Ligand binder design. Structure first.
Ligand SMILES: [Cu+2]
Ligand SMILES: [Cu+2]
Ligand SMILES: [Cu+2]
Ligand SMILES: [Cu+2]
Ligand SMILES: [Cu+2]
Ligand SMILES: [Cu+2]
Ligand SMILES: [Zn+2]
Ligand SMILES: [Zn+2]
Lengths: 336, 336, 336
């Protein structure tokens, strides 16, 4: 497109919503390319990440960890207004793995506190992609401080299996997995700091051990458990988008499966099927499609079980409906 | 199927055998669905895992690590009787990744010492799948204590390549890879305990470092080496099933290849081919098909060589037959 | 082939070049099978791997880390003359993952200082494959000391996408990723040794923690940055071969993508497409094909960002050409 062609395209302002939920969107594109407008503010703030009051200075897109999922269609133009409040203390930018050029947009979006920038790029490749902050010289630090999220570039005609048949989801949830590296004093307790910059040196030391202290979904242990469990019903088709901007993960739905899984997160690559556990390398997003068949509670975990049940990477799905004794049945309940 | 339909199905009792071997079975299903009966007893016992006398309190299905491989066909019903001897001290259950509902069957099989339970589920998805114990609040601990194994749900018509052509194996071996976390005293020596529960706290501390002390095949360093090496002959087609219920691994056959590899372990996903090294994420099972072409000794390892040659993840294949100088030949033997 | 048939085949001597570059070769094979001759000398020498003067006793094929990439065509015979200078102190051999039998050739190439050997094998499987030293009892130590590289067995008709259409590259670069384990004294400083053997015990201790101190491309931090950056131009098709003989990696081209990626590195397995980040398990080589669309500087990294920006796994691509405002444009430059 020429400058004149792009400016003439229909435009749409989308109001982002907090994860695990996703803003309203149509799976199958209606009409020609559009310029889709998103606005995100950067918030540097303290968040508690576990039941023991552990705090961390998060650098979050729209104040959440992970940042919100943005959805557009292949060949749409994503036009983002990124604002860095005069209230913040660090420079930030954004790098879309979905984009082409200038370090994913990082080289054109360096904004200091009190500045804003508007970046536009054409979403040429379909799939789910990671996006994260990446300021020269401080890349890992901003990412493992929670400054990352994902976008989804849906094919114009919606999703399809390898065979080429349509896959329509009833619900979609976005699970952002985050590895945190919280420094511990000489006595084992987690340290606290006044400002982000004060925790840098100590945090880098933990990072170099490549061993995270916490691995959580939606920014905190238990964030998606109990009453904040994701929901579904027997018969419902669910797309679960999962991202990890820095470290490997291996999602597993306990009691379920990944009927169709784009483990690489790219829609032009046929999905693997009937997966028990899939693998998403650090720096990538993936997606799993599943149709619930049994009611009850399910757990959704990173299957290095130590990371899931000790470090925090576990979420719940509460599913309603009728039990199917054909798929599974207790012939003899536990008995003497 | 209705209750009446299932109870009318032909039944078969299978006597399980110890890994790396697998019970008798037909690759191509003969007849309609069947209800396949398996019985497993849980044994909590001390096992030595290396040549230095290191001991561990294993929680093992049928007394072995890994537990035995169970084989059925897609759409068969697996009916398991699980027994927890009054002699044991902990509650145990079983979670089949092959199953649908109730946390893979874990929610319907919680049995205390002196109890038994009978669980039945329909094997709807073909492939090799992990199964492991997963009692609420103590999941990782029972798994890395060796309470895991795998099952194989063969397609009704046996295995086929992506092209859709039949793949018949002459032999099949099951290699269960286990990551152990043995506590070390203030002097570096491995600690020993009187009962399983006594080692819990110290073992959890090691688990949190995500660094295993041992990574072995068949429950011990050297378990499948020397005189317990797996065997084959030139011309023989071998299926090597590999599982890891908690941590990633990257199998490699030294001097060989993975001609066809279902790295994800699911038969409806076409296999990768001509693999030098394949990857199996923690919480999954995979399978590799290979036709031996050269006689001699081969090593089968997890290709993080430190884990293979220092930590214990190495096994041997002893292969008989005639040497093929076309594939490889020493033109000039080592000489001055 | 019979002995007489092989000796009658046309022969070619290839002069190897230092990575990231690759010796001259034709992508599409011209004529029938050939016996391709390569010569490599082993050099045990001290190399500095970072800007702080950290030294390591490298064991390098042709004096570089990684060793050079050798290219032949499927069904060609690779005939290697391996020389171990009387000047060296250790026994060495070579294990090609591309080969069949005798532990990849390791069992027929054990040479002490002052000896040489000539090994020949038929390249039956197409793809990029790792090769490394593997002397009995000291395998990991020689590999993580840099004694590894890769070869590429191109299909006779060159590369093709899954669809079966030709993929011709203008340039090809070979990035060998190396995990080093340098011992640190009681004060944190990196230790130095007089001879290779002297560092063994201390180095094994670091290896067992499975935590590398450095992760670099081409044997050193910054090796492929600044003025040694790899180059390309907008419109050019580049094949980037990547190997890791011991540990997992997840390559990512910042500002770009992997248009076609043989993540497993085997050409008979269709490539994944539109990848943001791909995964290469330890003990394997992979390849990514990409067509540059935007000029500027790109970073090529292992996407565990801590390993990339803290440990050393980062390289640069300097690309010339015209900027495409359709793919990306700064609508509002950073401003108050
Ligand atoms: Cu930032
Ligand atoms: Cu990135
Ligand atoms: Cu148990
Ligand atoms: Cu599991
Ligand atoms: Cu060597
Ligand atoms: Cu190897
Ligand atoms: Zn990994
Ligand atoms: Zn794949």
């Amino acid at each position: 497109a020429t400058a004149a062609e792009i400016a003439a395209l229909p435009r749409q302002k989308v109001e982002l919503v907090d994860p695990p939920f996703v803003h309203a969107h149509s799976q199958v594109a209606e009409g020609g390319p559009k310029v889709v407008e998103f606005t995100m503010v950067i918030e540097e703030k303290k968040i508690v990440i576990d039941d023991a009051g552990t705090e961390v200075h998060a650098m979050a897109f729209n104040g959440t960890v992970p940042g919100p999922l943005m959805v557009v269609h292949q060949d749409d133009y994503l036009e983002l207004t990124l604002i860095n409040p005069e209230t913040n203390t660090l420079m930030h930018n954004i790098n879309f793995h979905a984009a082409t050029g200038a370090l994913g947009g990082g080289g054109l979006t360096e904004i200091n506190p009190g500045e804003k920038t508007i970046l536009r790029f054409k979403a040429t490749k379909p799939g789910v992609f990671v996006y994260h902050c990446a300021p020269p010289g401080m890349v890992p630090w901003h990412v493992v401080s929670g400054m990352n999220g994902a976008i989804m570039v849906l094919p114009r005609e919606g999703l399809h299996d390898g065979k080429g048949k349509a896959l329509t989801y009833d619900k979609i949830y976005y699970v952002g997995e985050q590895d945190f590296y919280v420094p511990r004093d000489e006595n084992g307790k987690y340290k606290k700091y006044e400002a982000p910059g004060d925790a840098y040196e100590d945090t880098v030391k933990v990072m170099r051990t490549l061993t995270p202290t916490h691995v959580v979904f939606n920014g905190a242990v238990g964030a998606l458990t109990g009453d904040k469990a994701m929901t579904a019903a027997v018969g419902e088709k669910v797309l679960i988008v999962h991202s990890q901007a820095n470290r490997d993960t291996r999602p597993h739905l306990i009691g379920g499966h990944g009927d169709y899984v784009w483990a690489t997160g790219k829609f032009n690559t046929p999905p693997d099927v009937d997966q028990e556990t899939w693998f998403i390398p650090g720096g990538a997003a993936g997606a799993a499609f599943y149709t619930f068949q049994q009611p009850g509670i399910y757990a959704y975990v990173n299957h290095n079980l130590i990371e899931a049940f000790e470090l925090g990477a576990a979420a719940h799905f509460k599913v309603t409906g009728e039990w199917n004794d054909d798929l599974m049945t207790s012939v003899l309940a536990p008995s003497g």
